[PDB]
From Swiss-Prot:
Portion of the parent chain present: 103 to 234 of 256
A single Gene Ontology CC term: plasma membrane
Family statement: Belongs to the prion family.
Species annotation: Ovis aries (Sheep)
Membrane topology recorded in Swiss-Prot or TrEMBL: Lipid-anchor; GPI-anchor
Name of the protein in question: Major prion protein
GO molecular function terms noted in the UniProt entry: copper ion binding; identical protein binding; microtubule binding; tubulin binding
Domain remark in the UniProt entry: The normal, monomeric form has a mainly alpha-helical structure. The disease-associated, protease-resistant form forms amyloid fibrils containing a cross-beta spine, formed by a steric zipper of superposed beta-strands. Disease mutations may favor intermolecular contacts via short beta strands, and may thereby trigger oligomerization. Contains an N-terminal region composed of octamer repeats. At low copper concentrations, the sidechains of His residues from three or four repeats contribute to the binding of a single copper ion. Alternatively, a copper ion can be bound by interaction with the sidechain and backbone amide nitrogen of a single His residue. The observed copper binding stoichiometry suggests that two repeat regions cooperate to stabilize the binding of a single copper ion. At higher copper concentrations, each octamer can bind one copper ion by interactions with the His sidechain and Gly backbone atoms.
Keywords: Amyloid, Cell membrane, Copper, Disease variant, Disulfide bond, Glycoprotein, Golgi apparatus, GPI-anchor, Lipoprotein, Membrane, Metal-binding, Prion, Repeat, Signal, Zinc
Lipid moiety-binding region (GPI-anchor amidated alanine): 142
Gene it is expressed from: PRNP
Length: 143
């Protein structure tokens, strides 16, 4: 018997870094205790409509209220339990704990209407997260 593990790093293949920022200063991130409990695979956005309210006030207030609250959802597949109804629960689970943290320094800044908006954006990330896995279940199994 013999153990023959794998690894892309074990090969020590020739790398090819293409970035000048590496040899250039600017900004840095501090906080060991922070990253120690981070490393989240939070999604991202660049193109396509996020909420697509359709109105001017909704899109205007939302754009300015983008910092008032998180618009993305935190990922955390590290869990044995699993359920459809509980699925979305995770989207708000991590979002809630992280949400209060942001308001731990202030406690209140957003307006009354901002809430109604924050509720929608949060419902889009939770609803869009579920459909995601669904695409895999549908393709592999077109019931």
């Amino acid at each position: 018997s013999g153990l023959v593990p794998r690894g892309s790093h074990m090969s020590n293949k020739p790398s090819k870094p293409k970035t000048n920022m590496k040899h250039v200063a600017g900004a840095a991130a501090a906080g060991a205790v922070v990253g120690g409990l981070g490393g989240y695979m939070l999604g991202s956005v660049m193109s396509r409509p996020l909420i697509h309210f359709g109105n001017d006030y909704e899109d205007r207030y939302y754009r300015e209220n983008m910092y008032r609250y998180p618009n993305q959802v935190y990922y955390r597949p590290v869990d044995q339990y699993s359920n459809q109804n509980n699925f979305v629960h995770d989207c708000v689970n991590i979002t809630v704990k992280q949400h209060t943290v942001t308001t731990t320094t202030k406690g209140e800044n957003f307006t009354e209407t901002d809430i109604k908006i924050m509720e929608r954006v949060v419902e889009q990330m939770c609803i869009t997260q579920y459909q995601r896995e669904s695409q895999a279940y549908y393709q592999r199994g077109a019931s």
